[PDB]
Design an enzyme around this catalytic site. Structure first.
Site, short mmCIF file in Angstrom:
data_model
loop_
_atom_site.label_atom_id
_atom_site.label_comp_id
_atom_site.label_asym_id
_atom_site.label_seq_id
_atom_site.Cartn_x
_atom_site.Cartn_y
_atom_site.Cartn_z
N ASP A 187 0.60 -4.08 10.38
CA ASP A 187 -0.44 -3.00 9.87
C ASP A 187 -1.73 -4.00 10.02
OD1 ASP A 187 -2.30 -1.58 8.78
OD2 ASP A 187 -1.04 -0.80 7.12
N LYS B 117 -12.79 -0.83 7.86
CA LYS B 117 -13.29 -1.83 7.19
C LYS B 117 -14.24 -2.82 8.10
CE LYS B 117 -9.74 0.08 5.08
NZ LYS B 117 -8.29 0.00 5.77
N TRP C 128 0.95 -1.30 -0.02
CA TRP C 128 -0.02 -0.03 -0.02
C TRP C 128 0.95 1.25 0.16
CZ3 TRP C 128 -1.81 2.78 4.93
CH2 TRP C 128 -2.81 3.84 4.44
C1 LIG Z 1 -2.84 -1.87 4.24
C2 LIG Z 1 -3.64 -0.74 4.78
N1 LIG Z 1 -3.36 -0.20 5.98
C3 LIG Z 1 -4.07 1.01 6.44
C4 LIG Z 1 -5.11 1.42 5.60
C5 LIG Z 1 -5.58 2.67 6.27
O1 LIG Z 1 -6.84 2.71 6.67
P1 LIG Z 1 -7.54 4.04 7.58
O2 LIG Z 1 -8.71 4.42 6.37
O3 LIG Z 1 -8.25 3.19 8.73
O4 LIG Z 1 -6.44 4.86 7.73
C6 LIG Z 1 -5.13 0.78 4.62
C7 LIG Z 1 -6.56 1.25 3.93
N2 LIG Z 1 -6.44 1.04 2.60
C8 LIG Z 1 -7.77 1.60 1.33
C9 LIG Z 1 -9.04 0.77 1.82
C10 LIG Z 1 -8.12 3.00 1.20
C11 LIG Z 1 -6.73 3.96 1.32
O5 LIG Z 1 -5.80 3.67 0.48
O6 LIG Z 1 -6.57 4.75 2.19
C12 LIG Z 1 -7.35 0.85 -0.12
O7 LIG Z 1 -7.95 1.19 -0.99
O8 LIG Z 1 -6.05 0.73 -0.08
C13 LIG Z 1 -4.61 -0.32 3.95
O9 LIG Z 1 -5.06 -0.63 2.89
#
Ligand SMILES: Cc1ncc(COP(=O)(O)O)c(CN[C@@](C)(CC(=O)O)C(=O)O)c1O
Lengths: 412, 412
Positions: free
Chosen positions: A222, A258, A140
């Site tokens: 994470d 989520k 990510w």
């Molecule tokens: C691995 C990972 N860590 C942390 C988070 C952060 O979540 P938060 O909203 O509680 O701060 C996400 C969210 N990822 C999403 C769902 C959205 C994004 O990029 O923020 C995704 O589409 O990858 C994630 O995918």
């Protein structure tokens, strides 16, 4: 006329995942499908406020005893406690031994940021921005962003995905661990790896843990999808708990965005596990200073909802059912998409769709095929080939399946 | 066993107010008064949830159209617009010319933090951490902290509170302005100076503005008490509006924690005013990048409450009434306290008590006089002599006036 003090500020590149949400919304095309952001949707393609959440919200709305006075800097005590327990298990030795601390934070992102800021000041010396930080290849994007902003100068990658086997490169991963300088920080996905949907098995996790223990590598977990890898909260937290049982000190950034569907209430927790109880007190005191100059104290609505649910056995039970519902639906879409692609006699194998867990599928589409899908078919996804399985419904399954099929045959 | 990775982390030094409050709580005396409180309190010493807030929360609770999907990174569009409009006025030339941007943030603290982070990267060069940042002497404790954390290396103070006169040191302030290097950043309290309650009058603000204009000093307004201060929203935003009128570019960190009593929902807005419209999109693009790595996107509950209130004429009207109730209770405590001190023929001048504005007042008591009040009278306040007028009630006013009378006559 003196020039503006903003005259030379450049236009920044947009945050893609969020940019796509806007793009998708402004799309008049009737066939459009959003397979971008990791957000749950029903078969009707609607956002789902979990039944337990709607229930607790009404309870909160009718509780005249609540006020709006500032929460403590570290957050709602009951929330911190319940959140840590969820990750560690009710019976964790760490909890019994009182060597656990929790800092309520703004979603999983805020938990990551606070942890990174703490490490940059107090870990492996004082203000040591030179300790290497390792993230998975791929990961990510915000992992890089957060650690960079906290000041870490040396951000590295550990091999993880094997494009060939379309699976975990355990050998590369282990070699990367062996070669890392002692005390390096490893950002590990607890379960439902983003974007690959590929996690180590318990046996592989044991091998990883063994090297980390040997070389004093710091585990920074994470945990954004507890419950989505398998539909079971206990199962999904296994790796974290294993590291705790092995005697590691670690950080665990938890998100409730989520699993509670509370995306916009920004509910997260930073769980800290230390060797002894005294350390927790000192660490939390330093964490307060960091929070104070960032958001001062956290918001109450989301944390109240999560605390009320997890502390009420009946509510807790209902919630686990809601989580299973979401996970079950994902499994069903994996099957259907796989089935359809094969029925279209789509070139290549598609078993990876069903092997992968969590909300995503790392499809394998090249960036050219993605472009096609977005521009021609109005199917929104990340450039990497990542698709949100929850964006699929019985009603759009065909359009998607057919659109992928063309991209694949037409775009090389 | 190898030592904890946290073995050398020191215990942070505790904040005085926390202790004081503790002390207060632990005190058995039925005559005890807490003047160290940091939020609004009724005549019955209770927290107050504004009636309009309760009303809107119920409306929200019963609105089935609302979901919990992520807000855009910069926040709820309606909130950002309403917030900026409240500060600048509907008829603001800057709004009409489309040269205003707003970023939803985590209370006023979050707004100051995002603004400081932007400045440290893009203002007065690229990544220039040497530009002097000036804060008032004294100021809200967290100003120094936020700026230092953003990377600013040269934090200075401007003369402000005159100990002898018990009022503003306008000459000192102006000399500090005159000697500030061009482009220095000045953090200005919009109204209800915290912690002294001493504000410049409009005539004085014009002198301040003239030096700032000439030396290209950047106004970073901190606006935490609009409306709450005087009961008049327009009057409380006079200085901000004046600077806009005079053609300044500026930042304005807004908090809704006091004027909506939404302390624990962390609702703030960073308003940006630029010379040209095109600049706004570039500036906001850079703020998105900063938010992304800090909290990712902001919470919805508080922002929904504020946006709903400010956009409905009937609710707005009710809200203005609720704000005036708070402002009036403070005005009343100030008038009554001074009257009683003067009736007792207490040595010195006490007009500062009614010349000051908002919740906080610098009384002019010395540390020894403070010690006496705590120790002997069970009256809790800071060693600086700062009191919160909301700690006064129709019931304890006599006790407190008499006690101050004794402290001044016996200890001074
Ligand atoms: C691995 C990972 N860590 C942390 C988070 C952060 O979540 P938060 O909203 O509680 O701060 C996400 C969210 N990822 C999403 C769902 C959205 C994004 O990029 O923020 C995704 O589409 O990858 C994630 O995918």
């Amino acid at each position: 006329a003196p020039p503006s003090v903003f005259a030379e500020v450049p236009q920044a590149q947009p945050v893609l995942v969020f940019k796509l949400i806007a793009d998708f919304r402004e799309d008049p095309d009737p066939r459009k499908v959003n397979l971008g952001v990791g957000a749950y949707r029903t078969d009707d393609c609607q956002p789902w406020v979990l039944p337990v959440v709607r229930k607790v919200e009404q309870r909160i709305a009718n509780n005249s005893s609540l006020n709006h006075e500032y929460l403590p800097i570290l957050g709602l005590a009951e929330f911190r406690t319940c959140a840590s327990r969820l990750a560690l298990g009710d019976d964790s030795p760490a909890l019994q031994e009182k060597r656990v601390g929790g800092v309520q934070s703004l979603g999983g992102t805020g938990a990551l940021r606070i942890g990174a800021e703490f490490l940059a000041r107090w870990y492996n010396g004082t203000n040591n921005k030179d300790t290497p930080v390792y993230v998975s290849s791929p990961t990510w994007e915000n992992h890089n962003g957060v650690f960079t902003t906290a000041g870490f100068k040396d951000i590295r990658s550990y091999r993880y995905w094997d494009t060939e086997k379309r699976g975990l490169d355990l050998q590369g991963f282990l070699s990367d661990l062996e070669n890392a300088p002692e005390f390096s920080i490893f950002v590990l996905h607890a379960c439902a790896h983003n974007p690959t949907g590929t996690d180590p098995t318990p046996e592989q996790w044991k091998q990883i843990a063994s090297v980390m223990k040997r070389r004093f590598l710091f585990p920074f977990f994470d945990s954004a999808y507890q419950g989505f890898a398998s539909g079971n909260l206990e199962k999904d937290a296994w790796a974290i708990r294993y590291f705790v049982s092995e005697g590691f000190e670690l950080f665990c950034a938890q998100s409730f965005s989520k699993n509670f569907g509370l995306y916009n209430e920004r509910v997260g927790n930073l769980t800290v596990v230390a060797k002894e109880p005294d350390s927790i007190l000192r660490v939390l005191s330093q964490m307060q200073k960091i929070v104070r100059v960032t958001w001062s104290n956290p918001p109450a609505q989301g944390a109240r909802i999560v605390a009320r649910t997890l502390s009420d056995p009946e509510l807790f039970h209902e919630w686990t059912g809601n989580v299973k519902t979401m996970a079950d639906r994902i499994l069903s879409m994996r099957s259907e998409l796989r089935a359809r692609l094969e029925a279209l006699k789509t070139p290549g194998t598609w078993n990876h769709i069903t092997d992968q867990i969590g909300m995503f599928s790392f499809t394998g589409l090249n960036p050219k095929q993605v472009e096609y899908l977005i521009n021609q078919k109005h199917i929104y996804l990340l450039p990497s080939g990542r698709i949100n399985m929850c964006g699929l419904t019985t009603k759009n399954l065909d359009y998607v399946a057919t659109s992928i099929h063309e991209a694949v045959t037409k775009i090389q």
